C-alpha cells in the first residue's frame, strides 16, 4: 500500500509518513540544520529522517544522524546509499547497500498541474511534444518534473556534478516506468560512464512517486 515500497525493489527498505506525528525529535547533530528554519521545514526534516532511520534498522544500521553536504545531498553511512523527499502530505525514504545497488533517488510532488511557467523552464521542445500525446487523465507536466527530480538525486551520489532539466531528456510510458537519458558527458567519479537511468511512477493519495535505482553492474 505504501508508495515508494511500490516502485522500488524489495531488498530496499523504505518508510513513509503521511503526516508529522507529534514528539519527533532531531538527532542533537542534526539540531544546527534547523536551528534558524521555520516549523514547516523543521517538521518535514525531522518527520523524513524518522523514516530514513526506521528504514536503515531493516539494514541493520543503529540510529545515525544524517547530515547535509555542499550540494545538501544526504550524507549517509559508509556502504549506504538512499534517497529522501518531502511535499505536502508525504515525508519518505529509502535505503540500500553498495554490495546490492549503486544509487537510488526518489521524489514525491503533488498530483496537480505545474505551476504557471515552470513546464517551459524544465521541458525539452520534444518533450511538451511528447507530454501532449499522452492520455488525457494524468498531469504528465508534473510527472515529467518530479522524474526529472529523482533523476537528479539518483545521478549526484554517483558523478557528484550537478545535472540541469536541459540535461536530460525523460520519456514517460502510461504504463507506471520512464526512462532518463543524459544528455552531457556521463563520466562517474568510479571512471564508468552512466548515459541512461531506468525509473518508476505511481499516482496515488492525491500524490506523485517516482524512483530511480541504479542497478549492480554484471
Ligand atoms: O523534498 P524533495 O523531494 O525536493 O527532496 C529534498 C531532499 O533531497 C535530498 N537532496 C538534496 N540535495 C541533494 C542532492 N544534491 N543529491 C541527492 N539528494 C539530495 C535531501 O535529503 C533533501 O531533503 P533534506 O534537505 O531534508 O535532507
Ligand atoms: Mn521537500
Ligand atoms: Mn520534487
Known amino acids: 500500500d505504501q508508495l515508494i515500497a511500490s516502485v522500488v525493489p524489495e531488498l530496499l527498505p523504505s518508510a513513509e509518513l503521511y503526516e508529522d506525528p507529534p514528539g519527533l525529535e532531531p538527532l542533537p547533530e542534526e539540531e544546527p540544520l534547523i536551528a534558524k528554519?521555520?516549523?514547516?521545514?523543521?517538521?518535514?526534516?525531522?518527520?523524513?529522517?524518522?523514516?530514513?532511520?526506521?528504514?536503515?534498522?531493516?539494514?541493520?544500521?543503529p540510529e545515525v544522524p544524517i547530515l547535509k553536504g555542499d550540494k545538501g545531498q544526504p550524507l549517509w553511512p559508509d556502504g549506504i546509499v538512499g534517497s529522501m523527499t518531502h511535499t505536502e502530505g508525504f515525508r519518505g525514504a529509502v535505503?540500500?547497500?553498495?554490495?546490492?545497488?549503486?544509487?537510488?533517488?526518489?521524489?514525491?510532488?503533488?498530483?496537480?498541474?505545474?505551476?504557471?511557467?515552470?513546464?517551459?523552464?524544465?521541458?525539452?521542445?520534444?518533450?511538451?511534444?511528447?507530454?501532449?500525446?499522452?492520455?488525457?487523465?494524468?498531469?504528465?507536466?508534473?510527472?515529467?518534473?518530479?522524474?526529472?527530480?529523482?533523476?537528479?538525486?539518483?545521478?549526484?551520489?554517483?558523478?557528484?556534478?550537478?545535472?540541469?532539466?536541459?540535461?536530460?531528456?525523460?520519456?514517460?510510458?502510461?504504463?507506471?516506468?520512464?526512462?532518463?537519458?543524459?544528455?552531457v558527458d556521463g563520466r562517474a567519479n568510479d571512471g564508468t560512464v552512466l548515459s541512461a537511468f531506468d525509473g518508476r511512477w505511481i499516482i496515488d493519495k492525491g500524490l506523485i512517486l517516482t524512483a530511480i535505482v541504479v542497478p549492480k553492474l554484471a
Do not use: M
Request: proline share 5%.
Open 37 to 61: 528554519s521555520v516549523a514547516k521545514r523543521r517538521n518535514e526534516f525531522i518527520t523524513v529522517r524518522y523514516c530514513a532511520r526506521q528504514a536503515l534498522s531493516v539494514l541493520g544500521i
Open 95 to 183: 535505503v540500500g547497500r553498495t554490495g546490492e545497488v549503486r544509487s537510488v533517488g526518489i521524489d514525491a510532488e503533488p498530483h496537480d498541474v505545474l505551476p504557471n511557467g515552470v513546464l517551459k523552464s524544465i521541458a525539452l521542445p520534444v518533450e511538451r511534444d511528447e507530454l501532449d500525446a499522452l492520455p488525457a487523465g494524468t498531469h504528465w507536466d508534473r510527472l515529467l518534473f518530479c522524474a526529472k527530480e529523482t533523476t537528479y538525486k539518483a545521478w549526484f551520489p554517483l558523478t557528484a556534478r550537478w545535472l540541469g532539466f536541459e540535461d536530460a531528456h525523460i520519456t514517460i510510458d502510461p504504463d507506471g516506468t520512464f526512462t532518463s537519458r543524459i544528455l
